[PDB]
Amino acid sequence: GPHMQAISEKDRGNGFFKEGKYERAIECYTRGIAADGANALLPANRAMAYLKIQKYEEAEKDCTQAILLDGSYSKAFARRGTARTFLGKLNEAKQDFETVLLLEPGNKQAVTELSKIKKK
Amino acid sequence: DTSRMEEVD
């Protein structure tokens, strides 16, 4: 069924991501995001692979997609703030790390990555 | 505890 089809391309892309074949993970998750487009976990894994291949401009977009579908995923906000930090959008990343602290109070990244902003 | 960034499913 449709849920199991959207699991298959996730489970497939995860195995390429574990093998460090990040681009093949992007390809698999794209087939799922294109089949379904309503699961926040599909683009959440796609953004991680884009971030490993240093395409932070593309990783930002898939992190925003996970936040449009779910809106509560602390990992997707931490991944968007991290992408923006290497993208030069440091003031926009400050707001995303402050948002991770709403989703998990005292979050270890949401203190530390928000603290990296001030290394001026 | 809280969520780590660098991971997939």
Write out the two tokens for A75.
């990992």
**A82 and B5 in contact by Cβ < 8 A?**
yes
Task: Tally Cβ neighbours within 10 Å of residue A28.
Answer: 24
Amino acid at A99: T
CATH number at residue A76: 1.25.40.10
Which residues touch A103 (CB under 8 Å, ≥6 apart)? A72, A73, A74, A77
Candidates A108, A112, A116, partner chain B, best to mutate (most B CBs within 10 A): A108
**Backbone interruptions in chain A following residues (C to N > 2.5 Å):** none
Number of structural domains, chain A?
1
Which residues touch A65 (CB under 8 Å, ≥6 apart)? A33, A40, A43, A47
Technique used by the depositors: NMR
Which residues touch A82 (CB under 8 Å, ≥6 apart)? A51, A93, A113, B5
Amino acid at A17: F
**A74 and B3 in contact by Cβ < 8 A?**
yes
Q: Which residue has the tokens 């998750």?
A: A29
Amino acid at A54: Q
Alpha helices in A36-55 (DSSP H): 41-52
Domain that includes residue A112, residue range: 1-120
Judging contacts by C-beta atoms under 8 Å, the chain A residues touching residue B9 are 10-11, 14, 41, 45
d(CA A98, CA A103): 9
